[PDB]
Amino acid sequence: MLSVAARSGPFAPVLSATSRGVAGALRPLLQGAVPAASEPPVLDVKRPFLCRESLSGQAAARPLVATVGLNVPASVRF
């Protein structure tokens, strides 16, 4: 009984991930299908920080504040 399949009764196919390289002769049940999951929106890339002087000031020190406007871009203040 030195195997998780015989150790966990109903939780064996949850603890074990099975994928076949080639299709078997017998079809399985609960084939499953991805229902066309959505895409995250494309955004402009943010600059990285390669030096301490540019990284300085990026650490949060205040409660997070959101700001939206009718004709003003949204701002997040740390």
């Binding site: 994928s19 076949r20 390289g21 080639v22 299709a23 002769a25 079809r27 084939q31 499953g32 299908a33 991805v34």
Partner: peptide
């Protein structure tokens, strides 16, 4: 039916499956 077969999105065979429909 074995010649035609079965397939789902989790099969790892790729485009090299012997079934023409798959």
């Amino acid at each position: 039916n074995a010649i035609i077969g079965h397939y789902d999105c989790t099969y790892g065979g790729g485009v090299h499956l012997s079934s023409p429909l798959a």
